[PDB]
């Protein structure tokens, strides 16, 4: 249909504007100039260079963490403004649209984050850095579980080869849920979702006549974040209560309020 064909292009459209990152830049950095972030060396190199101010101290441990949570509240402005080319969203109750990001947002980022990691490592500071999963794992606990569970997702979802054109309809419908608590306007947000994940079916379908079964499998990887987003809180408030130099950016608190 010319009318869900162009739904799913102006979501694609809104997709490639808002957010810095899109998986035809992240492939483009990845084959081959990102400075290689292995060992507390190059660790150290990186920070003098790419996050200078940060460094101008506290354990490695928390300075990655602190750079972790900029990316966050820099992808929930990126989330917040995609957002609004998802008909319907910006005609929601001004309540409800803070609802649906705010249960939204983290499924969103580790789905996106997915498309600037490979096996060995992943992008990072807007593609100028590449950090290795082995450095990431080498972190003394609790920091060294934060990522390895990302990876093991990134990984399979990866395998689906996904583009911009089918993520960013991923994205628009996670942000769609008509299931998140407090909702005013369920009905209308039920709705709203229906039609997203309509286009999103037909899309993979004409995308993707290869995988027949690729819409029930996003189904189940939305699935799948919601429960990896549940895990990241409770390690994230774990580090809040036993690591007394680990503080949480304020906007992030309020997102994690009442979440799980
Ligand atoms: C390490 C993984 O983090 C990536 C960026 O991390 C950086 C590490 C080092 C540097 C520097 F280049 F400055 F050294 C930059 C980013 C961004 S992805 C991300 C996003 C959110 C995360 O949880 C924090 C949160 O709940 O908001 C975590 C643990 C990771």
Same mark, same amino acid.
Request: proline share 3%; hydrophobic share 45%.
């Given at each position: 249909?010319?009318?869900?064909?162009?739904?799913?292009?102006?979501?694609?459209?809104?997709?490639?504007?808002?957010?810095?990152?899109?998986?035809?830049?992240?492939?483009?950095?990845?084959?081959?100039? !990102? @400075?290689?972030?292995?060992?507390?060396?190059?660790?150290?190199? *990186?920070? &003098?260079?790419?996050?200078?101010? %940060?460094?101008?101290?506290?354990?490695?441990?928390?300075?990655?963490?602190?750079?972790?949570?900029?990316?966050?509240?820099?992808?929930?402005?990126?989330?917040?403004?995609?957002?609004?080319?998802?008909?319907?969203?910006?005609?929601?109750?001004?309540?409800?649209?803070?609802?649906?990001?705010?249960?939204?947002?983290?499924?969103?980022?580790?789905?996106?984050?997915?498309?600037?990691?490979?096996?060995?490592?992943?992008?990072?500071?807007?593609?100028?850095?590449?950090?290795?999963?082995?450095?990431?794992?080498?972190?003394?606990? !609790? @920091?060294?579980?934060?990522?390895?569970?990302?990876?093991?997702? *990134?990984? &399979?979802?990866?395998?689906?080869? %996904?583009?911009?054109?089918?993520?960013?309809?991923?994205?628009?419908?996670?942000?769609?849920?008509?299931?998140?608590?407090?909702?005013?306007?369920?009905?209308?947000?039920?709705?709203?979702?229906?039609?997203?994940?309509?286009?999103?079916?037909?899309?993979?379908?004409?995308?993707?006549?290869?995988?027949?079964?690729?819409?029930?499998?996003?189904?189940?990887?939305?699935?799948?974040?919601?429960?990896?987003?549940?895990?990241?809180?409770?390690?994230?408030?774990?580090?809040?209560?036993?690591?007394?130099?680990?503080?949480?950016? !304020?906007?992030?608190?309020?997102?994690?309020?009442?979440?799980?």
């Amino acid at each position: 249909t010319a009318d869900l064909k162009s739904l799913a292009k102006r979501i694609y459209e809104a997709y490639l504007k808002n957010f810095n990152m899109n998986k035809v830049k992240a492939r483009v950095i990845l084959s081959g100039p !990102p @400075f290689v972030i292995h060992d507390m060396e190059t660790l150290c190199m *990186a920070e &003098k260079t790419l996050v200078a101010k %940060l460094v101008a101290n506290k354990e490695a441990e928390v300075r990655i963490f602190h750079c972790c949570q900029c990316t966050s509240v820099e992808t929930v402005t990126e989330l917040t403004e995609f957002a609004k080319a998802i008909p319907g969203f910006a005609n929601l109750d001004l309540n409800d649209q803070v609802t649906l990001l705010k249960y939204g947002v983290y499924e969103a980022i580790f789905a996106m984050l997915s498309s600037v990691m490979n096996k060995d490592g992943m992008l990072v500071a807007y593609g100028n850095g590449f950090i290795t999963r082995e450095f990431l794992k080498s972190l003394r606990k !609790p @920091f060294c579980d934060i990522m390895e569970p990302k990876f093991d997702f *990134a990984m &399979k979802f990866n395998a689906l080869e %996904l583009d911009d054109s089918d993520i960013s309809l991923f994205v628009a419908a996670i942000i769609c849920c008509g299931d998140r608590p407090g909702l005013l306007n369920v009905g209308h947000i039920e709705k709203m979702q229906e039609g997203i994940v309509h286009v999103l079916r037909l899309h993979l379908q004409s995308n993707h006549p290869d995988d027949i079964f690729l819409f029930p499998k996003l189904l189940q990887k939305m699935a799948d974040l919601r429960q990896l987003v549940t895990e990241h809180a409770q390690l994230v408030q774990i580090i809040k209560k036993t690591e007394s130099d680990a503080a949480l950016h !304020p906007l992030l608190q309020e997102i994690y309020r009442d979440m799980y």
